[PDB]
């Protein structure tokens, strides 16, 4: 990792992150065979089997009722991202719901537990059968429940049953609680055997396959499930796994803290509002403004392209000489000098103005330094902690190359506009000069 302190604006840009960006969805359609359960009835009295059976049949009968429905940039982007995801998933479920497609899916899963299927709407879904409960119900439990008597002396039957239905009951809980669209792929929607098997079937390059098989917790975390329905005594649902059609491109993260100067004792503060993740995608700079969008694993940042807003390629001029590019770098400005620490990956920005006493120290030595007034950049090599008054921040002990891009801060070199002095999320030349 690399990190430039941009002295001109009290903001770091951290570079050398690689990219993984979701660009499509892969559909795995699971036929969980609940089995013959609605032909078994305990009728003798209270019993272990009756209780598990009633739960299983009650859950199944419940599930039949469950169904799905068949500028401040952050709020915009994360609005679109979720709307796009559900619409992409629902559009496929709405093909699979057709009885011609379910019966095709079910039929190709007759003698194999895994099938590749092409829907009439052309999507080449994978299909999977889960039968562990059906096999138990058909071979064991149907033979045990003689003539509706079921308080049998075999407790191994009843304890066994409470294991096999456990997955089914968990699937019902998750779809019913979420009204048919789960936010993430639980171990009960897709076990880790099936995720690895589904990943290995994706129509993707082996680089993505290896990367996905390593980061499979992220693949699980980005995907989501939709309930198709209950058909016969199979619940049918589907899991939209991500396809990471962009990888290995540059990304960087911009952090900022308030830059201020006491012009005649009045703090002309400025803060960059264009903070957050940026990536190059296919020859376009893409900005991911919402904090849910992107997550790191080492150098890899896992973003969603549906959350990205394209920004002009000139926008990196805001990281080189924001003072003097004509691109409209977004800032806030105003009178009040907030003093704060912004923890970057390889260090901390420390905004420290009149009032608070800021210091940096190491566990070996205590206070190493009292920081000057004004924004300072503390590499994670300079100290182990920063303090702001009595508040102590532990710094991220991480190897990387820090840099300083020197320059007199804008706040200290341009004059603030007399009125309005406080302006939120404006192009910089509206605050200064």
């Amino acid at each position: 990792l690399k990190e430039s302190y941009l002295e001109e604006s009290c903001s770091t840009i951290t570079e050398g992150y690689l990219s993984v960006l979701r660009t499509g969805w892969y559909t795995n359609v699971f036929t969980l065979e609940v089995g013959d359960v609605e032909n078994l009835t305990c009728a003798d009295g209270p019993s272990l089997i009756k209780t598990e059976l009633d739960l299983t049949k009650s859950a199944l009968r419940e599930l039949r009722t469950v169904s799905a429905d068949q500028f401040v940039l952050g709020a915009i982007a994360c609005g679109v991202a979720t709307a796009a995801a559900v619409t992409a998933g629902v559009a496929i479920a709405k093909c699979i719901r057709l009885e011609s497609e379910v019966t095709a899916i079910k039929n190709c899963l007759k003698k194999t537990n895994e099938c590749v299927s092409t829907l009439g709407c052309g999507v080449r879904v994978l299909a999977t059968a889960v039968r562990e409960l059906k096999d138990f119900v058909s071979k064991n439990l149907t033979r045990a429940i003689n003539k509706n008597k079921c308080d049998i002396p075999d407790l191994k039957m009843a304890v066994s049953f409470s294991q096999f239905n456990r997955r089914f009951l968990n699937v019902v809980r998750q779809f019913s609680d979420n009204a048919g669209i789960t936010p993430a792929i639980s171990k009960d929607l897709m076990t880790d055997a099936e995720l690895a098997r589904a990943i290995s079937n994706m129509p993707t390059s082996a680089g993505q396959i290896k990367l996905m098989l390593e980061n499979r917790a992220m693949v699980r975390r980005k995907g989501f499930g939709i309930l198709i329905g209950v058909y016969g005594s199979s619940v049918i649902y589907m899991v939209q796994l991500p396809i990471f059609g962009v990888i290995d491109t540059p990304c960087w993260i911009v952090k900022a803290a308030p830059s201020c100067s006491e012009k005649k004792g009045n703090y002309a503060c400025l803060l960059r509002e264009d903070q957050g993740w940026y990536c190059q995608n296919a020859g376009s700079t893409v900005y991911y403004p919402c904090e849910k969008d992107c997550e790191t694993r080492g150098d890899h940042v896992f973003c969603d392209t549906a959350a990205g807003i394209n920004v002009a390629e000139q926008s990196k001029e805001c990281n080189i000489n924001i003072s003097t590019t004509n691109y409209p770098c977004k800032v806030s400005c105003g009178r009040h000098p907030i003093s704060m620490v912004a923890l970057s990956p390889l260090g901390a920005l420390v905004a420290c103005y009149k009032g608070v006493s800021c210091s940096i120290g190491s566990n070996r030595v205590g206070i190493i330094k009292q920081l000057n007034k004004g924004c300072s950049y503390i590499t994670n090599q300079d100290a182990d902690t920063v303090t702001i008054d009595n508040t102590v921040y532990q710094l991220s002990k991480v190897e990387g190359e820090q840099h300083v891009i020197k320059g007199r801060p804008v706040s200290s070199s341009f004059d603030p506009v007399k009125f309005p002095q406080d302006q939120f999320n404006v192009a910089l030349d509206q605050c200064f000069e």
Partner: antibody
Amino acid sequence: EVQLVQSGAEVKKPGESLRISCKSSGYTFTTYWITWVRQMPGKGLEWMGRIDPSDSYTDYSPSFKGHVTISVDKSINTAYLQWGSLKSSDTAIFYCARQASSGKIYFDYWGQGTLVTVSS
Amino acid sequence: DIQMTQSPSSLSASVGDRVTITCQASQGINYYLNWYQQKPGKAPKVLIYDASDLETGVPSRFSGGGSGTHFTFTISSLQTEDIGTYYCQQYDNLPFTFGQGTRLE
């Protein structure tokens, strides 16, 4: 069409023997349980018991266990209900009814009821 | 035994009326409740099974619902042939007690 025609209407002195009959037809007789249901005149229905003709296993209501018996002539698709001693209280209409499933225990096809009357 | 209280013991209604009948077990019977119509001088006829499901060829004006202990049955618009006595029946455990039977006239 599944149809369960019954014996008819029968008159007895108390303590006489009697058997009702139900010639089921239109389905494979062994695969469904035959229930017997009693209705005292204008009163509620009372489930008396059932037989599985596949093996003549029987359940009874505790009220009737050991008073009535349920049987089948599997050879002629015919169930029976039989009393040792008819009490004069035991005058009612009796319907045999096919139990619709081994899991979903409703009674789907009902015989035309047999009147039994028992007095002296 | 599950006792099957059923109310009201009788009804009267116009054609078109959304009459409703209730059955209430003495225990939990899950959803194992059936409803029968008996026309006068006829053997009973099943209308609903499993608390909620229309038997085949039953007119879709009939309906029911509920679970656990309280169940209801509704004729969403009564018709002149629907005059008769209605019985609930649990099958959650042996013996399969019928309800008291509610006469609709």
